[PDB]
Design a binder for these strands. Sequence first.
RNA 1: UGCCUGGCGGCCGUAGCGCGGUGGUCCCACCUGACCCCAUGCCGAACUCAGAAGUGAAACGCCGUAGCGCCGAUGGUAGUGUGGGGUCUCCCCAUGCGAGAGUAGGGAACUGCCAGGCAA
RNA 2: UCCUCCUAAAGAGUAACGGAGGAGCACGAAGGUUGGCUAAUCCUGGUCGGACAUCAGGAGGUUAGUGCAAUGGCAUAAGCCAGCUUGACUGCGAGCGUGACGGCGCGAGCAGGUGCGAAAGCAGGUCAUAGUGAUCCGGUGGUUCUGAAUGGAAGGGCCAUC
RNA 3: CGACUUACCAACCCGAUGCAAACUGCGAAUACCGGAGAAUGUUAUCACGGGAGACACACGGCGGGUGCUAACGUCCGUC
Lengths: 75, 50, 136, 116, 43, 177
Amino acid sequence: RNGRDSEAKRLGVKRFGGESVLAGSIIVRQRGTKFHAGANVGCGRDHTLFAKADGKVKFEVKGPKNRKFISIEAE
Amino acid sequence: GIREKIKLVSSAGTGHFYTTTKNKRTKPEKLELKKFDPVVRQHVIYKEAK
Amino acid sequence: MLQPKRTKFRKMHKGRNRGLAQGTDVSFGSFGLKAVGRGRLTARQIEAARRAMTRAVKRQGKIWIRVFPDKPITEKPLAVRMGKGKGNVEYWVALIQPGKVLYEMDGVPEELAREAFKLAAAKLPIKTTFVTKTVM
Amino acid sequence: DKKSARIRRATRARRKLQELGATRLVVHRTPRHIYAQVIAPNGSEVLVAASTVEKAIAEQLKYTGNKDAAAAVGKAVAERALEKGIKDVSFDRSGFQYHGRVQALADAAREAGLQF
Amino acid sequence: MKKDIHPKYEEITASCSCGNVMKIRSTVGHDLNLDVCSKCHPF
Amino acid sequence: AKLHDYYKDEVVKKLMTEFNYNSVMQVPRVEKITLNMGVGEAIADKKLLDNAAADLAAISGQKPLITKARKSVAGFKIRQGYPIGCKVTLRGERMWEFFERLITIAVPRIRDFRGLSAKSFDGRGNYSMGVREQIIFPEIDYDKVDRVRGLDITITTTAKSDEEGRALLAAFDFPFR
RNA sequence: UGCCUGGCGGCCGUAGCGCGGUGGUCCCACCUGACCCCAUGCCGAACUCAGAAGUGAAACGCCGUAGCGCCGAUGGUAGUGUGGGGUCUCCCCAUGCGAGAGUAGGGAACUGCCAGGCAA
RNA sequence: UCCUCCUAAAGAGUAACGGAGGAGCACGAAGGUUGGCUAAUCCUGGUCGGACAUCAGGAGGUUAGUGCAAUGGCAUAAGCCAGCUUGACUGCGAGCGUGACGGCGCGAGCAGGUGCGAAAGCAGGUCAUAGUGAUCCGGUGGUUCUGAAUGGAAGGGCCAUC
RNA sequence: CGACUUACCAACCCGAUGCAAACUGCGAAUACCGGAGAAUGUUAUCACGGGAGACACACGGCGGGUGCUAACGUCCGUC
């Protein structure tokens, strides 16, 4: 009675650390918030992370819970 | 799908209306939301209707 | 007939038996039977070997079983075409890698221990050897 | 714990101001000597501070830790900020209800030039 | 202390049989008559 | 309030001498009292909750609040968020007058009295007890009520253990039979 | 410049827990009252206002202690890219990368800005 | 047909009559904002009350909860309570993700007019991921856009919707 | 109403030993994305236009599902 499946949602990181992006570009597609928005990064209703400014994207770990953050520096 | 669709008609003379859904079994009274009417470009009271 | 209780899933993938054994040392008794070959032991084989030693030692000492099946195996019924879903679970097997200690034992002389393990190994499908508890 | 509850209360506001990147007026209130500070957006340096703990401001008001004290400190921060140059700031409750002394300090500050 | 939600808490003087009289604020009502108290009792 | 002055007059000294503490605040002191009434039969007749709350307002000096079930359990046929009891917590000054009414007019009027228990301690310094009937308190006329349901009392203090809590209560001439 | 104290950070368990000691000149906390401001799905509990008597008990800060958590080598082992070999449902050789766990050990923090008291 | 996990070989994708489960909704609030709050499970004392109702204290730190299966996420809570409300708004939309295509998804910002807050600010539905059906034909309301000699009308077009 | 023993059943925990595609307090090698640089390659790259064929694949190595770790079996990934 098996045989059912769902179409893959093509999640994952779209832009990796150290590459320039344009404002509004999608950086990470995720179900929850595995990565939290940092500086110049906005979070969508579906927890999508997009660039709010033009620059280089970088990843880092911050906070007491060592949770991962994505930031953008104007470079 | 017991929930059924209704029409919200602006209190102004304009014919603009919104469309939504409601459950008549639980909340049979009318709906009187205050929404934006672009024909007159003002926020007015909208009344439920068919 | 060792078997788990209320396992999470009825069926599981075949997998592979690559790798190397982890429980390679005597931990409970003073003598043990180490696995030299690689393979899988069914629940029936484990029961048969256990009964052989208990009779050999005449219910003297202690017996430790260091392997549990915890892996269902299916088998299609005779005169059944391929497909139409996974087969029904038939028996449970334990994957054995070289160096795995199968049975442990204590409270008997070394001489009597050797024959007891030899009888058990005669009813197993994998090459085995006799080992003694090491000091550290 | 009073402190733990207060920090938990103000964490969301502090994070919101931090990511917004704007100078924030932070006020600390106690049974005596209400404090006030101005913090740069980075949060690493203090532009200017005032309070009723120093004799320069504690030599006039009858008692420190009342409505009059809050107005004096709220006023005191004003001309200091105006003299420094910074005009716009974001008020931070720091977990203190914006009802009494905190409100009085903010009211004195906003009417004294630090509109927010 | 919330208003017009609590029962009246007026003072009232109460005395028992063994001659002990005390004033207590409660909701007993108008008058009270007692026979025993903390003392003068076989506790 | 009278006993509060009595407590502040020499009881603190009595606590001071017996435990010879370093400071004055070290002595245990009561901070609040709590009244509980786990009626339980709201399901059979929820109408009785209001009057069950009413009498607690007679004993207490304020309006009780109705407590709701923490969770639903099939063994009691109770769903989550359903009121199944009421409680009252009183502190400040009003607790003192109620403490008078309990220690002077209530305990003596216990039907088939035998003595207040002394082993009713939670292990940290808090005292709890229960009563059979309401008529112990003077605020019941025996004609306006027709129920046998009782209530529970609990007094909590700043004691770090039972020994000082028992000693503090003994200073309040508790029976402790 | 130093012992301290409060606030805002950096950094985030070598930074966190447990046990013992230590602090009231200021600051902090507890604490008195609350008619008024304010609040309790009841309570000055919590929040808020008017105060400073008393206190360092609790909490908080600092010191000591490894009793835990935590960090952690070197070596070896497992795995593995590429090219070969075997008694090929698993392994070995040459070369490159190289864990996890464990062991020796480390460890009971460091640091920037502002404000206040004492000694300087 | 659609959703979640595994198979799937640490980017994405990836088959089988392979192994497990769900959906064809619900909600004018379960939405927006402001303010406040922080579980499960155990130990001790206490009337009915009893292992399991409610009260008090202690260990615990999220094993709780999150309208609905699963995965990911959630203390700044996305979890729980209350006040005021309709941003579940209109016209757009830089720039991206995803598809052979039809299409689907995210979105700063601008104009108009609103709600909450002292304010900075948040709000273009709901913690996210299922709750859905192209085109044709026809119905309803608005709009001189058109309206085959002219003025109208019928019928079409455009917009909203069935 | 105090209270006690046990040749006998046993929860939760502690010490040691294992197992897991649908467990993860850890975590590679490769692969993939982006940037800089030299050499090399008949632009090997991308965009647009004209014309196609093909959409029955097979075996071998490696990682797997299925089958009996059977099949010159069957179904995927990569060469």
